[PDB]
Design a protein around this ligand. Structure first.
Ligand SMILES: O=C(O)C[C@@H]1CCC[C@H]1C(=O)c1ccc(C(=O)O)cc1
Ligand SMILES: O=C(O)C[C@@H]1CCC[C@H]1C(=O)c1ccc(C(=O)O)cc1
Lengths: 227, 226
């Protein structure tokens, strides 16, 4: 196949979707075929659609979804609230493998953080990553609290020998405060910081977003993700 | 010795200090001697003093600390900015062991979440819980995001055979709301929920707060800590 990357985060609202779109665009500009896949999407009763936003910002046409639940809640709660069940483990894995092909970067965006349940019983994105031999790109914040959350996530990735492809800061303030700078430097000491997306990256239009995306990431690391 | 309990949290600002004070107050109301050790304290420029809060809210007098930094940052960054190393692993472990005595509940409060650096070099509250054979109480929020953070923190505990004394929600909202109430059930499925401190409990005066604390925890669980 090609290269599968799960895109998780330290928590919710940390920028997984905008990092997905931003990495997708940077890879597309390097001539890499990109698919983005969102096995579990909650919050549809308020218009959340990460697949839609990713296409909107990065022009990905190859967008695969699976489970959709209305309430803006954890996959497990939003399912119970809807009278619905979670997908099964081998259904998510099937969705990804069916996208996987050589020369393609397939991004699997999670729901919330790494240990959120996506399938019964206690199946997480980390388990999926094992099942499909994917590295995890961890979306982190610059805010106070990020250092503990990142260290936890990395440990949880290592506990199952899921390789960390590095961190992305979902929102980088212009200009940075004392904490923001301190965190960025400390983050860089615990893992590679693949990029620091500028604050407001998601309000950009197509071309602004594609330029931001091309600048955000090291061209040579992006190009190196897919042979 | 006695019973040592580290009080940690999923993160920062989740209610670690108020929960120490609350469990200290409930344990005091059960006739338990309570000491609270806060090795490293930051944000002192703006008035942060977690041991003072425990004193005022819970009446604890055995309040033990080693270092104070003015910058409202994680200990390693406040110390970086201040130009002075964190205390030594040895100082923290020995302070806590000296605090520990039979019949006393010794609470140990970190900074931020479980895996924050507190001592030289890269020593965490997890490492300290190991060294003094302490179990961890994990403070958590009711808010969207808490489930992943709690599951992450409990894993990090298990990975070093540090026992989990349970969860406390540091601020229970009024009224709950759908996500808070769904999280409370989910958390309870993950570990024992020992208490949910009502929002605003930190602004209580001593008598009010004591009454809250007496009522927040199970009388028998608390009494059975020593
Ligand atoms: O948690 C507290 O006790 C409040 C304190 C006050 C000053 C900054 C807070 C702190 O220590 C801290 C620890 C770790 C992290 C992090 O993981 O990035 C962030 C902040
Ligand atoms: O994808 C997101 O993170 C944004 C979505 C929007 C609404 C619910 C968010 C969600 O999925 C989620 C997942 C897990 C947890 C938790 O561990 O507590 C909280 C929220």
């Amino acid at each position: 196949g090609g290269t599968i990357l799960v895109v998780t985060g330290t928590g919710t609202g940390v920028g997984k979707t905008v990092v997905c779109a931003a990495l997708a665009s940077a890879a597309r500009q390097a001539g890499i075929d990109v698919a983005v896949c969102k096995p579990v999407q909650t919050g549809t009763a308020r218009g959340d659609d990460d697949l839609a936003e990713v296409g909107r910002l990065a022009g990905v046409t190859q967008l695969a979804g699976l489970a959709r639940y209305p309430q803006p809640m954890a996959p497990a709660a939003a399912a119970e609230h809807a009278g619905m069940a979670l997908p099964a483990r081998d259904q998510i894995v099937r969705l990804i493998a069916d996208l996987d092909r050589p020369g393609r970067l397939t991004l699997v965006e999670g729901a919330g953080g790494l240990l959120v349940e996506l399938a019964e019983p206690g199946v997480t994105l980390r388990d999926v990553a094992v099942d499909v031999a994917a590295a995890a790109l961890v979306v982190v914040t610059a805010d106070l609290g990020t250092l503990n959350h990142t260290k936890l996530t990395l440990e949880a990735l290592a506990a199952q020998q899921v390789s960390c492809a590095g961190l992305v800061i979902g929102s980088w303030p212009d200009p940075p405060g004392l904490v923001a700078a301190s965190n960025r430097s400390a983050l860089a000491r615990i893992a590679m910081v693949r990029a620091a997306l500028p604050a407001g990256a998601a309000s950009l239009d197509a071309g602004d977003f594609a330029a931001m995306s091309a600048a955000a990431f090291d061209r040579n690391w992006v190009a190196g993700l897919v042979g």
